[PDB]
Design a protein around this ligand. Sequence first.
Ligand SMILES: Nc1ncnc2c1ncn2[C@@H]1O[C@H](COP(=O)(O)OP(=O)(O)O)[C@@H](O)[C@H]1O
Ligand SMILES: Nc1ncnc2c1ncn2[C@@H]1O[C@H](COP(=O)(O)OP(=O)(O)O)[C@@H](O)[C@H]1O
Ligand SMILES: Nc1ncnc2c1ncn2[C@@H]1O[C@H](COP(=O)(O)OP(=O)(O)O)[C@@H](O)[C@H]1O
Lengths: 590, 563
Amino acid sequence: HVSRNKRGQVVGTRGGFRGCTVWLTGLSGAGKTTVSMALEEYLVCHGIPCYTLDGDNIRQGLNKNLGFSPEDREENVRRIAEVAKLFADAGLVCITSFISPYTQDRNNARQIHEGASLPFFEVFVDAPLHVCEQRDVKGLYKKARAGEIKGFTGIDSEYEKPEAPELVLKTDSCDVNDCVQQVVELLQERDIVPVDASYEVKELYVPENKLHLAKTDAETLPALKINKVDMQWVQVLAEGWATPLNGFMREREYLQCLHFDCLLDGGVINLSVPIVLTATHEDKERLDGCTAFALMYEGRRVAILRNPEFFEHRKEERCARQWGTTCKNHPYIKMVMEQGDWLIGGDLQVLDRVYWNDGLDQYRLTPTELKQKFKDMNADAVSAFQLRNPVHNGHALLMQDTHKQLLERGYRRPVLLLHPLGGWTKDDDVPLMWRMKQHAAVLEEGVLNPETTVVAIFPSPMMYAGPTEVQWHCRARMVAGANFYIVGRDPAGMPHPETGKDLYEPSHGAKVLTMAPGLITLEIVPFRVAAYNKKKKRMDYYDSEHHEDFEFISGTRMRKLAREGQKPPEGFMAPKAWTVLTEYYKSLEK
Amino acid sequence: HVSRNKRGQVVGTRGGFRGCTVWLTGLSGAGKTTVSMALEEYLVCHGIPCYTLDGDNIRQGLNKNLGFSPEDREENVRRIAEVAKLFADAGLVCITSFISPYTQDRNNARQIHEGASLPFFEVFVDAPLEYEKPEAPELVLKTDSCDVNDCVQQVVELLQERDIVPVDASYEVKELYVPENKLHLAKTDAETLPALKINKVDMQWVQVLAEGWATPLNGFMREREYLQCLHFDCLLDGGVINLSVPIVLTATHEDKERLDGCTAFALMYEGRRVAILRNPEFFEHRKEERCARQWGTTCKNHPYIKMVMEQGDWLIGGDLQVLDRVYWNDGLDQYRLTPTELKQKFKDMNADAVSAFQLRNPVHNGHALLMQDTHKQLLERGYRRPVLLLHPLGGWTKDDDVPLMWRMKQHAAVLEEGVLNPETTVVAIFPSPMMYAGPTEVQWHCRARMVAGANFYIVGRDPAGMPHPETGKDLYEPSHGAKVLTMAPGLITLEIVPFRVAAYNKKKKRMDYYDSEHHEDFEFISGTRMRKLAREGQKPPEGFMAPKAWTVLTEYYKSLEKA
Ligand SMILES: Nc1ncnc2c1ncn2[C@@H]1O[C@H](COP(=O)(O)OP(=O)(O)O)[C@@H](O)[C@H]1O
Ligand SMILES: Nc1ncnc2c1ncn2[C@@H]1O[C@H](COP(=O)(O)OP(=O)(O)O)[C@@H](O)[C@H]1O
Ligand SMILES: Nc1ncnc2c1ncn2[C@@H]1O[C@H](COP(=O)(O)OP(=O)(O)O)[C@@H](O)[C@H]1O
């Protein structure tokens, strides 16, 4: 015969043998039918073939010749157990749904399974006899109280409670979802049902109560000195923004990311940018072989990377695939080109909590802290606005028009996550402190409402990789609990350093995002280019037949106006936000 | 309870509900046992969950309390039939192997099935020597007089007829040829249309498309498809399927402007109208980005990138209706099988597994080793008639590669020498241009073969690579092709069979897998070294290449030298 290992490559789409028997037992009306039906449905919605033995298929086929007097009752269970073991042998999750009141009959069913190395999960669907009588789902209790059913178990027979059930379901204190979840978690604990890849936040910080230990432990390890952009990726990871990574990407994750823009093990997860740690040939030969090493920023041990692996940093290829150009003078590519030729993946345990002592640590909320913030505000929708530039009223418009659309849909407490990036940025961008003072100003003028707006800083470095990057911007906000992701023209783009043309076609980030896999809990809210409209004296959506009506105001014109001592047109930006920028531009010329 | 249709979607890996019972009956123990065991292996080898009820799992279990009384035996057969019913209900092919001598009982078993709307196939294993021969069995297996595999084939054919086993569950090929009954009208209509001249590489991609290798594209990629392809290596709309290379048509600004607005236009190659492209859309090429994402470099001297860089700034997608059957009239057309002709070929040869070997170079015995070991692997896993699709690429190749005609002559010599077995090998030309994009292109090599019905796809070292024209180092990391392919999405109906690098073992005098400890037992002979050796009138070591095949290459290199 074909082995269990091989029958399981072909039973279902999920690999690996998982035949077993989930043996429900309890009083008439305790919940067995209802649990097995909901379990079966879960299993089938998750790709795991199963089959249920119950009163409707056993009693009138195989067991039709069995009456009620007690040797028949014993034989009934025995036959059910033998059939179930056969189903389990065949690679199915067999669910059985019979009162099965006697301990001896159920231990026998367990032993027929265990003697054949098939898992047997005895699930006691436990509700008091009075409750099951109350329910009297099929009117059998009312018919027993007045004769003409037998030793109806609970009344004229006994029900013998299992002594060591794999699970007890207290159906008078829990709901059907509680039941199904408790059973599914059992089956996951026991490797019958796999744990799919998830976006549920996963911090890589060691628990506070394990901290001091981990620090001591970190002291005994060899060490690798990291730089500030790295430390900032250490924070992206620590806080969960790259959930479910367990650390810097291993080879297999890096290659998935570069070719498919997704992690694929255990389900499709969007992750389009490498999150890697680099190393020179010298650091590799030093650390290669150790099972753990510490990462050291500004002479402090900030994280431990366990079970590391070293693989090549094929830099030209990485760059080409991530940015769609290998141009040496792209400012993030320039840094990648100066890194080592090795990458290191492993499981990252981050130690002290990351704080930059710079005056802005109050805005650097983790995804958990943000989710908590959204619930504390009782939002029923969260829209996110990634950005790296001062907010002008073209951005504000996209935020204002999304807030509108969510009102018109029915939401009654939309919250805006105004989410500037604070990780590394290229030289000629507006420094983070400036931009935050600038958005504070925009909020003080009420262009965005401070009572419905959370302002926090996204710790990722900025890569300037367009349609590749904007998936990362988007997914990061989905992790933090955004339900809606606002995207306009050329997101994450910049001019090509050699040609001066746009590196990326401006509609690409949005088109790509609207069809990118793994972006399941959010909706993409895309917008056309907005620009100062000179006729209507406000920011508006650009229109082609009407070219003369619109002023495009670049970071470069603004810097010019600020020197000349002038102002952009009224309604381009909030006057106090402008003032912040004049103060910015003043220090810049020095 | 979840319905049959829904249980049918999760039970196995092929989709469609196919619960039924194959009820063997007859005296011969070995006949029943050999048939059930082999049918079981076949079903599992082909992705169909099944389960056998026989003495070894019923007698001492479910029926352990039944003996030989006429009543016990009847009950014995009743219980097995009800259980079989439950497996068939669960979506499995249930095979039961019991003498079941009595018409009454077999007939009852059938009614338990037929009354629950489950197919029941009574198979009389008839091997003459109060058994009651079935009056109208679905099948008669003469097991004493036909071998096991023909018997199993008989059952499998019956299951195909009755829609349990798929006649064919490769990905359905979508040709883009206009059907032979509409061609004349379609060529007349093409005559009325504007025209866009295309070159020969284009006309090869027209062929890729026509013949269905890029299923489910309906023609040259529209923007959406191009973006999915470059970012995700897959088409996504209505299902994820692997497609990692752009399949596109380029155009100049001048041709875009002439043609933008037209709802259809003809493609013209050597003065002939070869295709119509309908409802075209024009979008920006973006050559540097395309090149970077597709090849992992923008190096201007990579020989396909160099062609992409001389094409126009526009791409044109649309619905492609290919007219005349593409034929090249160079003497190799007999090998240019479409995916539909290949599937039919594999049927005619009664394959029960197809292993594909993509290549673009002369076959040496390292390549052969991969094929031979694959063939071993398939036999060991239960396949009885594995067929090798030897599938040289025949579209554009770079300047110093061995020309296609010489390669086909070389491979005919390899098969003439028995290094691969001509009787279990189909030799056909894959019509794609070769891009030399390594791990990106290897997915395209693999998906193309999937559409042609390959069940297993062999991949080795540095598939689809080449030296970086600047450094001469490998453009791609040499393990990446395999690693990426083994995990690539959208290639669900075949299996990847990856191999480590093979090389000439001096000690053993044969091609073998390389070993780091043993570095110096291994000679690596490149195409370069082959050419040098020919020029000085030497041969490679014995066992590296079939002799007749080497001789073809000397003829090739000789014709170079005349040049
Ligand atoms: N958490 C629970 N799990 C299962 N059933 C529950 C639960 N809470 C209430 N019930 C109800 O209890 C009754 C159980 O009936 P049923 O499943 O047929 O019991 P059994 O099959 O054990 O005779 C149903 O009406 C069901 O909705
Ligand atoms: N003026 C514009 N009109 C429409 N959308 C815009 C405009 N300017 C910026 N956007 C969009 O607003 C956000 C702009 O943020 P911006 O700070 O430059 O940084 P980035 O796009 O790098 O994240 C993105 O969604 C981007 O597409
Ligand atoms: N010496 C070798 N050892 C192992 N695999 C090899 C070897 N040479 C080539 N291969 C593999 O053999 C197949 C054919 O190689 P080749 O004809 O050179 O073309 P390409 O790899 O472009 O398809 C590919 O799977 C390739 O990885």
